[PDB]
Amino acid sequence: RRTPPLGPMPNSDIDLSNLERLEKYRSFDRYRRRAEQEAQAPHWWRTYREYFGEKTDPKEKIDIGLPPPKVSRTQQLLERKQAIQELRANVEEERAARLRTASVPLDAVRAEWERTCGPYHKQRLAEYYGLYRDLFHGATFVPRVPLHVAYAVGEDDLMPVYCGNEVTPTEAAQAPEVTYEAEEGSLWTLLLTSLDGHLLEPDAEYLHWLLTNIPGNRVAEGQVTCPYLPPFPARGSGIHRLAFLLFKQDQPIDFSEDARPSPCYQLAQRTFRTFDFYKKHQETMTPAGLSFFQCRWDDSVTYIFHQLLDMREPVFEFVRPPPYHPKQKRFPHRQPLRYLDRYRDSHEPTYGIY
Amino acid sequence: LTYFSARKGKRKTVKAVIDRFLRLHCGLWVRRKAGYKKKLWKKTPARKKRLREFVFCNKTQSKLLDKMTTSFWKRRNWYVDDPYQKYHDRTNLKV
Amino acid sequence: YKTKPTHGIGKYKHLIKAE
Amino acid sequence: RLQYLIDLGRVDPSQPIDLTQLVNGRGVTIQPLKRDYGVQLVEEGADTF
Amino acid sequence: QKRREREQHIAECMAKMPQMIVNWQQQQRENWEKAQADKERRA
Amino acid sequence: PVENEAVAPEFTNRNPRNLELLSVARKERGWRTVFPSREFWHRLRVIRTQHHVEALVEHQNGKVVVSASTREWAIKKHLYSTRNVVACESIGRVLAQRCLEAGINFMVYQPTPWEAASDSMKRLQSAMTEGGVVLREPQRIYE
Amino acid sequence: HLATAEWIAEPVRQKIAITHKNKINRLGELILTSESSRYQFRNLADCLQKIRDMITEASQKLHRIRIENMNRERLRQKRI
Amino acid sequence: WHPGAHVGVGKNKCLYALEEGIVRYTKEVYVPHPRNTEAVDLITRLPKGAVLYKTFVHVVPAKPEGTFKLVAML
Amino acid sequence: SKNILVRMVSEAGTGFCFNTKRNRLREKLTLLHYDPVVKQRVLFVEKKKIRSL
RNA sequence: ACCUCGGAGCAGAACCCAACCUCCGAGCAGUACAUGCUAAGACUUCACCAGUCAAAGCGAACCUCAAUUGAUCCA
Ligand SMILES: [Mg+2]
Ligand SMILES: [Mg+2]
């Protein structure tokens, strides 16, 4: 029996009567390019994508954030052409390019990159680690405003904080310095949250470093509702990603639901839901910045368990499921002598009635 | 197989299966796989290890030789320096 | 499978030169 | 079993225990013509002794 | 006495392995060099 | 009896990256006959076109992790040409910074025989190794 | 309790503390467990044997770990 | 058939699962290794705009690798 | 009578041995092999023949 | 004339299927010497004998071909 094809089968638009005049696959690289763009395209038949590909809804994610400024593409393109034409006109780049001795300042490229198109890439990184799906249950934004944070270790050196960095708790035991490039008249807000830090329930976040009503870049007079307490990544719990996020407070708002006393290290008070928190307080403002890092267990984590948090430290551990074995059969055949050892519980011997 | 002898009228076990097999008290019988001492040069490593490993027996051929043997060979034996002590008994067997 | 609409999707000899 | 048999009182701990006192107590059978030259102690029972 | 004389015999030959091993690779290289010398005449 | 002392038996972490960082996640084995080896968690792909050069780290599911591009204005303002060996070593050096920024310490990159023999890719391979990224993973853990 | 044990000398005591930070309790007691065998005597046997092996060595994946520590160290070139 | 999604291959071209779960069959594109000359030169003879497919078995991992469990509250 | 099967012996005196095929015309061979006792690659020399094939 | 083994049609599409039915072949060869040791889980020439695939671990590097062959005792 045969059935017609539901959709248009491949290699159908082509014609077989004309075969020699057609242009051939010159190289392996041309084939895989055709194969790859074919793969990203959809197909009606059952494929690898519809089994192990996240099940994103067809509707685009909602993001009422800061739109881009209206840059004049005409003048912007002309200024770009002014830069490359004088670059090619220079004399020293010819030798340096063809002798392979040139380089580039990394931090300078980083500085101009994060101002030009960084927030789109940081948005891409955010959804990869799962910041948006865990925070807003899918809704996204674009952190247009840059954001730099550092942990002052001693006085000479410091640990930076950017998207996807590891941070030690010993260096994160104090408060960090923050800069977010705003002089801009109105207020701002900042908060530090841990997504997977909670242990009693999923989709619950803690809060370690909250500041509100910060006029301008200066951070000192910004009042704190939730005072500082470092995180506590337990041994064996794995890795916990700590998230910076920042909003554009257009006008001052009170904090009654959110107001907390002197720190007192009560996780029942520290825990809440960012989803409902955004729906109540943040209807006047919108996201402006974002960053995050990762933390792990260390000696200072053990210190705060016994001394600061006033509780016993937990000790988790990853346990795999047991190795599967089939149902026993009292007369095996063509199996090694250790068929019994695969099912015996006690490795030691024992004698029943003697 | 020689159900009643002539001098005493009792079953008689042939020493063939004694040299070939071994009993565990649960009723199981094991054996060394054949061809494990011939033409090892041509065999792949996966084959010769499969031959070196022991193998149990089906219930039928186990039942067949069980009819042959006598009750003396079926008793419980507590040997010393015997690795088969862990296996004479059975554990966690349902149906 | 033959009865299914996906039949003839993997065949490739009808493109290349026959010899 | 040794803890069990003394609790039953068939073999007295006041006197020295022996294979004779054991087999007189019928603690375990023995078949010397079946080539068993005695009896071993077994670690199973370390508790409650 | 049986395990001692064989173990020290193994230890004796053990110390001799790196010298003969270095000679072993040189044999294959001398056969490699001799291969190029002969097949050039075959060509 | 303390609220802070209250702890559940099981701890549920909703981070898929937690397992691979612990070397516990499963890497897709198979495709031995097919060229791109699925035995990875983070793969890089180079696209050396006749106009620009691209490099992007991607996850096993085909999702992009981080990208570096010669089309980006921030990178090309300081190059003479968008495809020279200088571009391949420079894009490799800046990608090493990005991988180290995004916590990507290990990753996979399978070049073809001609791609590996190319001096540009060799200097590209030398770039992130100096930056502090190695093109190898540890073997999986399980028993 | 570790620090109270007079039968252990001073340099051995803190050596066990810093090298076995995982097992110490909040109250300061070192906790140790073993469940390999069904016999509590044999369980107590290898328990003190591990303790004996610990004090002896005190009196005397990591490849991946040091890589990231080197990666973290070459990332933090930053002055105030 | 051809492997995929935790399905190894033996020397006798037999497919075998590596993870515990459900089996699935699909059809995807086939790109050989450069060493497979008969398959590499084949795709070069093909014309651009046309692509060949092949069957692929795929095992769906049912259960996760494991679970984080409390060991001691000290 | 093209090939010939030959055994080799451990020069360390351990007694580990195996077999491999050899051409009837080719000269004596000396190759490395992983001895399970010595537990590293060590040179074995083949001594005599066993059977033709 | 044949007696064993492998491939194709009969047997078109999961498996199997005979005829003194129609054809082509095999009783080797080549390259390494980790062609090392162990181990989860399964198939199996319709029984058994056999024949097969192999995760992972120790220890290391950084097999192709299709049949390509033979049990027990004994030496
Ligand atoms: Mg069968
Ligand atoms: Mg393996």
mmCIF file of C-alpha atoms (C1' of nucleotides) and ligand atoms in Angstrom, chain J residues 44-48, ligand 1:
data_model
loop_
_atom_site.group_PDB
_atom_site.id
_atom_site.type_symbol
_atom_site.label_atom_id
_atom_site.label_comp_id
_atom_site.label_asym_id
_atom_site.label_seq_id
_atom_site.Cartn_x
_atom_site.Cartn_y
_atom_site.Cartn_z
ATOM 1 C "C1'" U J 44 21.058 -15.235 19.267
ATOM 2 C "C1'" U J 45 20.584 -18.928 12.872
ATOM 3 C "C1'" C J 46 13.727 -21.340 15.829
ATOM 4 C "C1'" A J 47 16.225 -26.503 21.587
ATOM 5 C "C1'" C J 48 21.122 -27.196 23.407
HETATM 6 MG MG MG K 1 16.918 -18.816 19.918
#
